[PDB]
Symmetry: D2
């Protein structure tokens, strides 16, 4: 699946619909980024710029002008075409093709932006700009307003009101359209297929990085060239470190392995976590921690629906975890007291769920302590985990265990749809998958 | 292979050996880098910082102080240890472990650098600093010198002489040690193995990006997690674009495919280019252009040795190319005149060779028009190419063809060693390899 | 006269009255300014900061917070008291005295501003700030908003709307109160008294700078320590240069001298220009140019009233000037055509009138081509001039003559009040004043 | 007196004589400076720029290039001429006149500096630059070096060594030439004449600022338009504040008045302090403190000579002060112990002497605790003072007294010359001068 021109158009109109009359919205592209010396990282367009343009070039600015409640138009600044530059660093849209390709009214050369932008802004009342987002953008916008302010003898005037569009735009991205969901559904399928391959490929003696390569190859072959975030393969005690990306260790028979990987497909992010035995068979100590994390996930998946919140479902997961850990002797005392003492926090120290979208940790307001009432169209992760440090004062068999199980869901009219259930998580189904592969 | 502690030590002493008495050299680490929102790219240490420390953390500064011709010592500023931070973003060396692990005399907290650095610099005559390399570094160094200048009532004084260490350090990196060469030799083997796999895997109907995934998987499985540069898979007319990285097109039976990929192994870069038929069989038009590019490579490999230069070997390649193109009717006129008219340049528009090392386009002085006399220990690429644009006024059969063949060599006492000959380039050996794979 | 506490209070309330509910206005003080090395210029408070505080310290910020339509309060950040610092660089208000002295609700240490300001702004909808006014201020405000934006996990939120208060505040300053006018009336008397002294003191052989010293001494003795702008004493051909401040030349018998000086009294600016013979007797050529400039001034003073504009009165002055210059042969042709050709502009090349107040070139909107309808309370200068360059192609006797006559007026309910008529401008009254002094 | 072209030439050659072969020295002019809105302070050229050019324009850069030990030349960047701009903001030298007027080899337009400077610097080994002196200068120089560094394919190269010229240039300014001394001698005469006038004019009932106006008028009439520093008139308890410039108080019969004023004449600074009774007659308590300060000055003036130091003469002054204060009961205990306890410091808390020159607090190295051996040609102030705070626990009659007496001297071959003895300081000679004036 993909995002059509029509959808990019609707999004711009949805934004403009909310802008005041006599205003201009300025959305800048991401700068290129050095990796070392003159070699650069693969380009990643700014998410908000991408959201409105589907245009993957740097040195580009969308300008949406609203004259009144029925009049508005779009100017794109982008790089001019250049034979030399393209024979080297590759094709560019240019100005001729831009209006038709991107559905914008006008297209001007980025090199002229300092001589043009202030003219577009002259006489307006409001300018919507994301201050401090990019330095070069602030330079451009401040430079344009200075011309207008100091140029009253040339009958210029600056908009006196600047407004952050980020709250507005991020509220928009918080609610996914059917097109967005179809794309995310596929990023789900692709990411899940990679996690299955990792489970099937893993043998003791392989390195954590070998499963990374397997996952990335799978993303790639389905047309998801880059991951959504730096992949984590934490075997053994490395699984207790939430952002472990060294992936440098030999995987040992007896250890668990926590794999956290996500693809980026048409800009949208998959994000799955699966934990499993390197030797294909859970031990009793591993099962005892795993069944608690799994029940937390399965209950959350039953509970997530419109009307509830992340805060609320989290309360149910806390209860499941404290109760489970008491029964294992990892915690001692009354369950209810232990909850009010947050006794779980040394072992489960992150949130249950985050928004998912163009960014893996997606934009949108959570509300105080994530108490926001969920509504259909919201996409989020469900990711309970338990992490018992190597030197935790608990029964020995639980020390140095890190387990997380993460799924991606979308809130629907009567509950949620699970986008990542195509990769197994029930421990017997994991063990069966892995036994199958060792045959073949 | 790898780089030992001893080697990192020697390098620092080699630098200090050249510093003046009463001086301090300041080498800063690379900053982390955003990819989108709060997710970051995989960390890539500054090459010069890596060269002297083998230390892959940000927020770290090497300070080498030379008191006189026999007295000198090293202070490392690096991040302090922090349980919380490491449970999240992963392990850190800290100050306790640093002196022993990295072979430095002292280790201080980066957070204290503003309160400490000016003390280290007080009373010196010279400070070696790479101005404009990183903004945060310039802020730190300028801030330290301002304290010293304005603090004469506290008996402080600033070094009045600042010197760029980059010329000195890059001259050092231009000459590889036996350890460096062993590492580069393996980056050669790994990169070559990937290009062979790409040749064996390619079928018509596959996308350019599918061969990218095959190459990256191969790098990964040999412990080269990231490439040295953004991989190019240019099939058909896409091969005429020198930095084509979209890799988005279906590969067609009849087209050639130019694959330019390199691994990064222990920090050092492989860089290979191979061009071949998507269907495993060169056409006559393809052979006619390929044999010219290949003869250029084979002659260059015979000629490269101590005493000659890149400029000089390039002259021989120009002659081979002009002569070849005349015989095909791509160029008309006297060969010698055509050379003095640079008639080849529309078709071969980049250099023959670049330095290779910690950076793929490696540091070191080429001399005017790359006329520098080569010496043993120099590592460089040999990469002739011919690119006939789709709309070139030449016989039709040559239009839209892009061919390059690149090998990595090291200059030795009596010639060069080819690090990448383990992947085939003779057209019959390419066709044989590909026929073999299609069986299976 | 002076400005009371009550007036400073009213001004703040007038500003707040116009702010939106749930907003904060941030007004910063001027930075100290180096003259050479470590010696600084006399401090000059930012006019807008002065306008609301009457507080002549740097490192100070007024914060006016509007909670709703009946609730609002003021926090002043200012420098803490310090015995050492004051024994050196002089007294400071501190925080204890500030609420009572300046009539503000709270007073905090400027050194704490980064730790406090974001707390004041948390949860508001609008912040009024003058962007690009001072660099240190922008750093402070951007820093405060970044904390609030990135701090949603600490239940912080930034105002999404920033608004320039300058248009609002400058509209306020455009209309002077009775207190302001009494002060300006005295700045008028003082400035006029200086121009009379200059006329009485001038002999041929004195230098232009000697009359500067006389003027400044007069300002000083009436308690106007500094001038409003750099004083101009342009004798002879130096009078053709509108901002001639070298004042370095010997004044010659036969030349005219244009003196443009203004005092600064309680922050408010006088601005007078008078031109006169260095030898106390106008020649015929001087009278012929002088009578045109004078009639322009006298007619303008009759015409200036509520209902008309500067543009309109300027049209009458153009007519007077073109007609006068035709009769002298300086211009040739029909008067009406010459006006439509702007034939006067080589000789009268600046505006007739500028707003006067806390700044000599005072704030407030002129409207296109200064067409704004005048209203009572507006203070402005009336300053026609004619400047015949030394090499102008006109009759010899007019070359190298520069004459301007400037008065300060305030628009009243039925016309204007002249604040500077206490210094003579009729040529016979100038000559009489000067003859009297020579006795002284 | 004044500074000739020849002297400016010698100074440049003296600098070049010390530069390395293959180097360029870059000396930038001062930027204009805002006072309020669009009105600016009187221009004050950077002292070091003035020192080598005698050129009082902004947007100007001296470039001294040293090719070898006998070859060197000067390029001045300065503002181009412009009719419009000069008819407004006044005359400019331009490029045509500059070589002859300023004795430089070449003169280029400042507007071209970014396109030219890097060409001048290309291929050099050293560039002398004052980093952090002015922001615009650092931008220019960093910009020029970046072009050269990144432009090796255009056979450019940057000087790898940057050196601060300030230590070198300030050592030069520390030793005044006969021309400089003649100028300083006159700045002495002028400043002294102002202090005499202040003594003769002062009556009780006058304000501190009235004597400021008298002093400035005197500076002005001798052709010293601006003071060297912000004038201090501290009567009564205001005299205990070392940098008291409010000068806002009525001068009371019975109080002392400390006047600290200095002129700026041809760029060079006078700096005199005199203290005296507002009513022309010292009381006994005033005499008792005054005679200690005066004996300190008179002994210092006998002692200052080549071979001694400021530190050393200061030791003698400490002894005089401690002994004097003991005899008055202001200090109790053994004199020698009290000295080793620095018991004087609450009452005499600044240095005895500072370098004087183009800056009042002039450049040049003092050595640790001002221990530098004095040599002929050094110009410095001699300024002992005693300041008894209003709430000091000492006999009542001494509280709230501030007395300083400052003279300017130049070290000669066999002692010093007093430049400011033309204004009286013996108390009977003060009282006589003041009685004479009252007749006016
Ligand atoms: Mg265990
Ligand atoms: Mg073809
Ligand atoms: Mg004349
Ligand atoms: Mg007393
Ligand atoms: Mn997640
Ligand atoms: Mn290459
Ligand atoms: Mn005026
Ligand atoms: Mn002094």
């Amino acid at each position: 699946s993909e995002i059509s021109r029509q959808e990019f158009q609707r999004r711009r109109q949805a934004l403009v619909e909310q802008m005041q009359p006599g205003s201009a919205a300025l959305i800048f592209a991401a700068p290129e980024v050095t990796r070392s010396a003159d070699s650069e990282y693969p380009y990643r367009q700014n998410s908000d710029f991408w959201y409105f343009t589907g245009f993957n070039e740097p040195e580009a600015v969308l300008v949406l002008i609203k004259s009144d409640d029925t009049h508005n138009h779009s100017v794109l600044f982008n790089r001019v075409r250049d034979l030399t530059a393209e024979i080297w660093f590759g094709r560019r849209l240019g100005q001729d093709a831009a209006p038709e390709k991107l559905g914008v009214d006008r297209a001007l050369a980025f090199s002229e932006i300092n001589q043009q932008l202030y003219q577009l802004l002259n006489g307006l009342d409001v300018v919507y700009h994301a201050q401090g987002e990019y330095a070069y953008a602030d330079v451009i916008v401040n430079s344009a307003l200075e011309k207008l302010r100091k140029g009253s003898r040339q009958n210029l005037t600056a908009p006196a009101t600047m407004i952050d569009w980020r709250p507005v735009v991020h509220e928009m991205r918080l609610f996914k359209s059917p097109e967005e969901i179809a794309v995310l559904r596929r990023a789900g399928e692709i990411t899940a297929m990679a996690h299955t391959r990792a489970m099937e490929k893993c043998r003791p003696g392989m390195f954590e990085y070998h499963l990374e390569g397997e996952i990335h190859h799978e993303f790639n072959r389905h047309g998801a060239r880059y991951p959504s975030y730096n992949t984590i393969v934490g075997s053994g005690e490395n699984g207790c470190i939430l952002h472990y990306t060294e992936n440098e260790c030999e995987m040992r028979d007896g250890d668990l392995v926590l794999i956290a990987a996500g693809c980026e497909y048409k800009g949208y992010a998959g994000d799955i976590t699966r934990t499993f035995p390197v030797n294909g068979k859970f031990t009793q100590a591993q099962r005892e921690i795993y069944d608690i994390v799994l029940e937390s996930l399965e209950t959350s998946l039953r509970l997530y629906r419109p009307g509830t919140s992340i805060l609320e479902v989290t309360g149910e997961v806390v209860r499941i975890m404290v109760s489970g850990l008491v029964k294992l002797g990892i915690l001692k005392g009354d369950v209810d007291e232990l909850i009010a003492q947050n006794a779980h926090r040394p072992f489960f120290m992150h949130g249950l769920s985050h928004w998912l979208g163009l960014d893996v940790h997606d934009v949108g307001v959570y509300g105080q302590d994530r108490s926001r009432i969920l509504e259909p169209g919201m996409v989020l992760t469900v990711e309970p985990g338990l992490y018992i440090a190597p030197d935790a004062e608990v029964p020995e068999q639980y020390r140095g265990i890190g387990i997380r199980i993460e799924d991606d869901i979308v809130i629907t009219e009567t509950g949620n749809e699970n986008l990542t259930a195509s990769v197994v998580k029930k421990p017997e189904e994991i063990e069966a998958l892995m036994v199958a592969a060792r045959k073949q």
